[model samples]
Target: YDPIHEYVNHELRKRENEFSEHKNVKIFVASYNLNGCSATTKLENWLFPENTPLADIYVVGFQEIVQLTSADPAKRREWESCVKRLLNGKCTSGPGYVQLRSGQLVGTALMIFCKESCLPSIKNVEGTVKKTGLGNKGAVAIRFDYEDTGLCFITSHLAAGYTNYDERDHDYRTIASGLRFRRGRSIFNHDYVVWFGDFNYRISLTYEEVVPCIAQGKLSYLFEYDQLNKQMLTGKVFPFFSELPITFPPTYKFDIGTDIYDTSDKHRVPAWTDRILYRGELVPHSYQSVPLYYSDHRPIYATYEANIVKVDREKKKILFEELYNQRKQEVRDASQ
Candidate 1:
């Protein structure tokens, strides 16, 4: 009501722990290109792994859920319900993970889940989509506030084919500019950002040149010519984002149900077409690719831990009142 009270409240919000009560939040993000395929019979292996602790937040995204240009809410629902079931099954009891937000733009879909214990701290959960060329190719993004942190998750399907990486670059810039939310908050405004999907950036080497590198386990060398890495290095795209080293084999152009590369007449080049990039004050623990025949591309998974800040308002209020009255007295009497 007055400067005396306002001053104390402002001080508490600024100097005192608008940033205390730290909690470590673990996050799991996975991306897959379904290659126009539907649900597979062996999906459990894609999401479940033993000897691993559960993450507080789960973000899963897919591209090419179906082939047709017509909207496929049916396929979207199928994947959505399947994700809900698998997450709930992983928990030992009820009140486990629940849907926080989800979005779909044509063949692209993104879903986010959070443990019930952590759900209350998340608010302003909203979903958005940005279509570059048309509804067939674009991005699905979700934004929310977790405690004192703002987070955004994006699953974008960029252009394909060789030399179209320039087109993919444009898609990202378009999405970055068009995907906006309330109060002028954009994707870049979040405290943490997770972006993943079939980025379509290929290896800058011939099939012949890359095969030996794959056989000899020289992935570190292959990474030297990765198109995405080159773009990031040149600062042409994904500026300021970070990703863990890619230790797995290429995830693209795989045979449907075998550990083999494409065998068609065209003979597509093997590449790390599926990827995940993150930007935030977070620590990445693991980055890997899962082997599943659900799609032409194996799913890429990443795990990270970030600190969330919390403040107990009851304690903060008491401290504020005492300081407020003491300052008021000093102001009125002008005493030391």
Candidate 2:
């Protein structure tokens, strides 16, 4: 009886050691449609909010970072340097941030930054680009292994125009099918995936009709008419991904240098064109739109605590190799 009890206790202890408690990793995500503008001022508020703890990882995406006609490597370098300086801040010491990877496809760019201490746990960095635009609209994606958990981050600029909803959907499908990394893994294969950028989905209502709702501060009333929400409900695109409720006002069609809505000849309807969506186990801390006035679109950001399972890389590799060899043997058997 004593030996049997000892064996049971040892088995329970080994089982418990195999799977541990959830590890929380804070992630910050922001997206902005720059309207062909450059960083004119410091991004302190947009990057780091007041009274909020800094996140372990930062993913920033920009649309129209530069005009298609003027898109050049020099422009990309300038923007990257500017972002790095802001991310590092004035501190020469302390938890320094490192750029894990950055990719640009004409007007769209995706950048990932990780804290120095967290770098060792990350590996297998790779990127992919998909072009949906005849020349300008597209997506840039980066993937990495975070402690054996695969993570994929994508920034995309889809088709624009109120009547181009189908075109936008097509663009999304094109990107989903076209973007592939060296491992031949799709975006959805990752354990965690974040998609952000100027999606360009508009309100179903006309400009005249949507303005009254915005003026009355009835953002929720407009949600039913949001094209993106409708598409999600119908399972047209991004079926598994989830987005936080839009508590703030719309983030698009603002006048440059002001909070005023579009007052030009176009009189564009205010819409949540800029967005961030994620798939995985994450608890959102905050979702907001920055009131920066540098562009016609307000920058949007979200903070989340992602629950990452602590992985045993060696054990995982052993299991993977076993499965891989089994599959290879099956292929050979079929040929015979």
Candidate 3:
């Protein structure tokens, strides 16, 4: 009996060691915009799988479904259902959680997803059309809390007006104010804040004004502060000078049939519109600029290291189980 008991104890100890070894989770964030006019069929054809070499977080914008002046319940539901399906397990290898804000289709939409952990709390802030003569089309913000580090990821598609000062300034202030007023926690306490999207502004002005403005307040512009001086920047295209130059030279006008013109006459139509800005707490794990041809805009990806200790496995497990059970009971009750 004593020999049997010792064998059982050893087996149990081996299982415990295996469980404890499952530490350290790596997360990847990828943001993209599917072309506005592409059909559902085309989107599927152009689909980039989200799971393998899996992206812990995925954000997509510009799945265009034009906003109607009058309430059309059928159309609205159709749009929502289609987007939800695409963002969920329908288009990817794993189940994905999706949230889309209804703006003018081709205007703005935000989609987010992960495997099982690292869920995000998302919100949309409508833009005030002060400078661009355009109303607040929309902006999406997500808060990611993993163990010790908390990160806020925000993306916006600002106006593409011809003029530089008014449109860009308004968008910049709107972003700054939105970050300040909307998320007040940053001022008091610090967390990683990443602002990225299609700004439609040139690189020179982006540095001279917008970067400085964001730096002035509670935010830090990641690209502008990279290790480079005036000598290095001169005579070379500004956007490509970053540590990662692969993301430069404008992401739009890839279709050869269309002739896109730039004001500079440099024949290079690249604008530093799509960008990633970061600040606070979590360190950058790895960053990349992926040039995707599916949309007019390319995507930006960033990964971060999460510093954490003492994960509450039991509490989370019980809470989610209880929530699921309650939901099941509600369904059964309704059926009865």
Candidate 4:
């Protein structure tokens, strides 16, 4: 009966019981840079402790795990021990589970909590996909089976670039292509896939130039673009609440917000890089935003109907490379 466990138990009784009529399918996706240390990993441990109301599925993408691959073998072992200790808890878990995507082990890694009935068939795909600005950093794809429905969850940290358009487009294409290969063997025919991460792209901000790469048809965006660039939705194929706008800024600056960041050096522009992209056809039961105090980025949570529903086969569409080129020209024309 730890305090964190008590709080989560109370939350479960409060939220889960009230929403039980919705068929009980909920998943939360989050990412944290972790300030690059095993010591900082505690921030996540405290926030997502065992018995804390539990996310039906949770995936974490971490950056800057310097100690995990340090030069000193002793230090590396010590850090690994620290990580295991931090993740220890009830909820049928200790040290959680991680799938390494790269041989170097310094780039990116994914952590998952496999709860009752909801077990993930985890796989790593890196060589099959082209590299993004995040370098040869790997990707984690987790498949969860519910009766006949197969839901795939992918988490990645794409290359972070200030203005490298060609490199960025290459990365996006590589990722999309890799996932396409993974989706080829589907008995379920149609399934829900949520690919969320720090994409390093902002539609309305400066610093990064990925928008053009995403726009010029060189990179494929899962969402359809608006005539005036106004009504864009990430998970358009899902049965989610359509009225909820995507204007919720996903990143906050510590220099400006007291509750989210503790220092100004960590200050950053509010961006929508952290997102949850799902099969637009699967209507989500509900969704909400959770602020992260320890890091600069916030988390997105969504719940869906547990009873597997079929996604319209026709809804499975990808924009042609030519159309993307056309849109880029249109944008240039409008700008002029």
Predictions: Cα RMSD each: 3.4, 7.4, 15.0, 18.6
Worst 10 residues of 3 by lDDT: 123-132
C-alpha TM-score for every candidate: 0.88, 0.86, 0.51, 0.51
Instruction: Write model 4 residue lDDT over 107-211, tens digit each, in one string.
Output: 444444444454332233222222343333434454545444566655555555434433444554556555432536421233566655555543444313333
Ranking by TM-score: 1, 2, 4, 3
Q: What lDDT does model 3 reach?
A: 0.43
Specify the poorest-scoring 10-residue window by lDDT in model 1: 41-50
Model 1: lDDT of residue 224: 92
Q: How do these models rank on lDDT, best leading?
A: 1, 2, 3, 4
- How do the residues 1-336 of candidate 3 rate in per-residue lDDT, one tens digit apiece? 554345444554454433233234444444444344333432332233334343444444342233211223344345445545654645456556444233222344444445444443223322121122335333555554544445455556666543443455455555555543243543112345555565555433332343334335412243343222221355221222232342233444344323232323333333445555455544555455454554455555666554433334565445445555666577689998
What does candidate 2's lDDT look like per residue over 278-303, in tens digits? 88867877889988888999998988
Model 3: CA > 4 A from native? 1-25, 33-35, 39-52, 63-106, 117-138, 162-166, 179-190, 203-248, 256-268, 281-294, 308-336
Candidate 4 least-lDDT 10 residues: 222-231
Clashes of each: 0, 0, 3, 16
Model 1 lDDT, residue 20, Cα = 64
Model 3: residue 224 alpha-carbon error in angstroms:
11
* Candidate number with greatest TM-score: 1
The lDDT, on a scale of 0 to 1, for candidate 4 is 0.42
Please list the C-alpha lDDT of all candidates, in the order they appear. Answer: 0.84, 0.82, 0.43, 0.42
Candidate 1 accuracy as TM-score = 0.88
Can you list the residue pairs that collide in candidate 1? none
Q: Model 2, stretches more than 4 Å misplaced?
A: 1-16, 19-22, 68-70, 90-93, 313-336
